[PDB]
Amino acid sequence: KVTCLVCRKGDNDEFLLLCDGCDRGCHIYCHRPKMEAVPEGDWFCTVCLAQQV
Ligand SMILES: [Zn+2]
Ligand SMILES: [Zn+2]
């Protein structure tokens, strides 16, 4: 039950980032600014970035 915040589909899961703060995701091809690959190390969605201080 993992979907992309931008386009609201959950296909091409090999291109699908997973937030390490929660259970949301993003296709790398939907992300702006540009993202050429899935990174090693942690990625945080914009909802989790709002919780930062
Ligand atoms: Zn997408
Ligand atoms: Zn998150």
Domains and CATH numbers, the chain: 1-53 (3.30.40.10)
Q: Resolution (in Å) of the shown entry?
A: 2.7
Alpha helices in 1-53 (DSSP H): 46-49
Taking the CA of 46 as reference, the closest ligand is 2
Q: How far apart are CA 29 and CA 26, in angstroms?
A: 8
- Each as own residue / partner, the long-range contacts of residues 4-13 (CB below 8 Å, 24 or more positions apart, any chain) are 4/30, 5/45, 5/46, 6/30, 6/31
Residue 13 φ/ψ, nearest 5 degrees: -65, -15
Residues with CB under 5 Å of ion ligand 1 are: 4, 6-7, 27, 30
